Amino acid sequence: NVIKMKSSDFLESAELDKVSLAFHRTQGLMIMKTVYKGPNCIEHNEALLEEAKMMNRLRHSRVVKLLGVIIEEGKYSLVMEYMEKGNLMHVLKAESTPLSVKGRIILEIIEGMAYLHGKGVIHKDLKPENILVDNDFHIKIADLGLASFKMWSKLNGTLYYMAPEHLNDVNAKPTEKSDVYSFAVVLWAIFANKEPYEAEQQLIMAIKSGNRPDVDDITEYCPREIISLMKLCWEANPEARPTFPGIEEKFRPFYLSQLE
Amino acid sequence: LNVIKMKSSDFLESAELDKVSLAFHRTQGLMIMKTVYKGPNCIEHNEALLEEAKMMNRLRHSRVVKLLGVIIEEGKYSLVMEYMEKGNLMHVLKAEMSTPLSVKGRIILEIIEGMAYLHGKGVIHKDLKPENILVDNDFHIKIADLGLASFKMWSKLNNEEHNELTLYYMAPEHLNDVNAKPTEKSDVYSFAVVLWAIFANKEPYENAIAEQQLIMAIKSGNRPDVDDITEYCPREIISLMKLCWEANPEARPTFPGIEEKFRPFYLSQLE
Numbered sequence: 189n190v191i192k193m194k195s196s197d198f199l200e201s202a203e204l205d206k207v208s209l210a211f212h213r214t215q216g217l218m219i220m221k222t223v224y225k226g227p228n229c230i231e232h233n234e235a236l237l238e239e240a241k242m243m244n245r246l247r248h249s250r251v252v253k254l255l256g257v258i259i260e261e262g263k264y265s266l267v268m269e270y271m272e273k274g275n276l277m278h279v280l281k282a283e284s285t286p287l288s289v290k291g292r293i294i295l296e297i298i299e300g301m302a303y304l305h306g307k308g309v310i311h312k313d314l315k316p317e318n319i320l321v322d323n324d325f326h327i328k329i330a331d332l333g334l335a336s337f338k339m340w341s342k343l344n345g346t347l348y349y350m351a352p353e354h355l356n357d358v359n360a361k362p363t364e365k366s367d368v369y370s371f372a373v374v375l376w377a378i379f380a381n382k383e384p385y386e387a388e389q390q391l392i393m394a395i396k397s398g399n400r401p402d403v404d405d406i407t408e409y410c411p412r413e414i415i416s417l418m419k420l421c422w423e424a425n426p427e428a429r430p431t432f433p434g435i436e437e438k439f440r441p442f443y444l445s446q447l448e
Numbered sequence: 449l450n451v452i453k454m455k456s457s458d459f460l461e462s463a464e465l466d467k468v469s470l471a472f473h474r475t476q477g478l479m480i481m482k483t484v485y486k487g488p489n490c491i492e493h494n495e496a497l498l499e500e501a502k503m504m505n506r507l508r509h510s511r512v513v514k515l516l517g518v519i520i521e522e523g524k525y526s527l528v529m530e531y532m533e534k535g536n537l538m539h540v541l542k543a544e545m546s547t548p549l550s551v552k553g554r555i556i557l558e559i560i561e562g563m564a565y566l567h568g569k570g571v572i573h574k575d576l577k578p579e580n581i582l583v584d585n586d587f588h589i590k591i592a593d594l595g596l597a598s599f600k601m602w603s604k605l606n607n608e609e610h611n612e613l614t615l616y617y618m619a620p621e622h623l624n625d626v627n628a629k630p631t632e633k634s635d636v637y638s639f640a641v642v643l644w645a646i647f648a649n650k651e652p653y654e655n656a657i658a659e660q661q662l663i664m665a666i667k668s669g670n671r672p673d674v675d676d677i678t679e680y681c682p683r684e685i686i687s688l689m690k691l692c693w694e695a696n697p698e699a700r701p702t703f704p705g706i707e708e709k710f711r712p713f714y715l716s717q718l719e
């Protein structure tokens with residue numbers, strides 16, 4: 189179960205924009221978030237470690253693997269796999285992705301979210317920043333803000349992807365349909381190549397009042413069946429929105445016949 | 449959803465195959481029907497049989513077969529699965545003799561993806577073999593349990609007196625063992641002989657004469673002749689199969705372990 193790491197395992201560690209590049213002795217390049225550095229904490233190590241164990245049980249080709257956890261005297265860090273091309277929005281913005289690649293990106297997003305929901309894991313904050321892209325344009329879904337992990341989160345454009353049921357009511361526990369809304373605005377982002385809603389306080393009333401992204405800003409050719417999908421995936425009533433198994437059953441045929 | 453309980457009237461026609469039968473549904477298209485029992489009207493095992501069909505319908509993944517429905521009628525019991533056009537894996541290997549390494553590598557990766565799902569649900573496949581690896585029109589695969597190994601109640605309903613109707617892939621621990629208690633490693637052994645079959649385009653052990661000659665010789669160390677598959681199998685796949693068919697099961701890896709290494713190898717070398 190455990191891969192408890194030590195700081196000693198890493199030869200060097202170059203800082204990033206507390207996220208940090210880190211070269212492991214036997215295992216190569218990795219990315220390390222040191223979430224806390226301070227006094228020796230009250231005994232929540234077991235809780236933190238059990239939570240890290242739960243992150244580590246999430247093992248799937250389209251989901252990021254937590255490779256290890258470092259809990260030293262006044263130093264708490266998590267360690268993940270190195271993804272070369274970074275987040276999805278950076279890949280969309282940096283230079284001209286083909287429809288075949290984006291279609292596959294969508295299929296891998298669906299495959300990954302389906303796994304997550306299949307493990308009883310709702311993603312509270314799904315968005316392009318949380319979709320990391322490797323060297324060969326294959327993706328992995330991530331929770332870089334630690335939204336779903338309560339204890340690590342406590343130890344430390346997000347409103348745009350959040351469902352209107354949550355904009356109304358902060359006490360509302362999310363569901364499988366919460367993420368399908370997010371997935372819809374992700375789809376729009378994938379064909380718009382930009383973050384939506386190009387003021388913060390004012391916008392929240394409009395979205396709860398029915399507003400969605402401007403579809404006429406998708407100046408790139410997006411297929412009708414994908415535009416159909418996002419409209420359905422962002423419906424205001426959650427019971428109207430499909431499940432990810434329902435989306436996969438339809439979209440996998442569509443990918444292979446038309447997109448691939 | 450639940451399982452769709454179907455009626456016989458739902459199918460327009462049903463032509464027999466190698467009791468497996470091709471069957472066209474009214475609204476829902478071409479399907480394959482295994483009619484497991486036809487005889488007198490059975491004792492109330494229906495609830496159990498239906499519960500069993502419900503339970504095996506929870507097994508939902510891109511690389512395993514969907515039970516589409518179940519027919520429970522007076523003295524006629526059938527399961528209905530999805531139609532896979534190119535048939536089982538060995539039929540694809542033999543009838544083509546035309547399959548690229550890239551496609552075979554992908555077929556292996558799909559077998560790994562599927563077995564990983566099954567084991568991830570706590571389901572051991574007792575009888576894994578090429579006959580149980582079904583191939584669609586686009587050479588994509590789905591794993592199946594056509595002998596009803598994992599379906600205890602339906603398998604018992606077949607063997608019924610009243611009804612009017614593997615050794616090559618078996619791990620040596622299970623050879624000559626009536627109390628064969630399977631593990632995740634049971635399937636990995638089978639997976640190894642499957643890999644060999646994928647590159648040999650044939651069943652193993654074609655110079656074996658007696659059955660007891662085969663069973664004892666395998667338990668005494670024998671595997672499929674690797675000299676049949678130096679015609680082009682990569683060394684890393686031959687390495688894998690040797691490892692996956694090791695006589696001590698503790699040496700053999702898990703399917704997640706196989707996937708972590710093999711998926712990189714597929715994309716860099718094979719695809």
Ligand SMILES: Cc1ccc(CNC(=O)C2CCN(C(=O)c3cc(Cl)ccc3Cl)CC2)cc1
Binds near residue numbers: 309333336
């Ligand atoms: C809902 C859901 C979806 C997918 C997953 C799969 N695992 C994860 O995302 C890990 C969460 C923990 N983590 C990090 O905090 C992290 C963040 C940065 Cl910027 C850099 C380095 C690190 Cl180590 C690693 C990745 C978990 C939950």
Ligand SMILES: C[C@H](NC(=O)c1ccc(C#N)n1C)c1c(F)cccc1Cl
Binds near residue numbers: 507573591
């Ligand atoms: C998920 C798959 N399902 C069938 O094999 C299946 C579906 C329909 C029929 C029929 N007839 N079968 C055997 C399956 C199991 F349920 C149990 C064990 C292995 C596998 Cl591969």
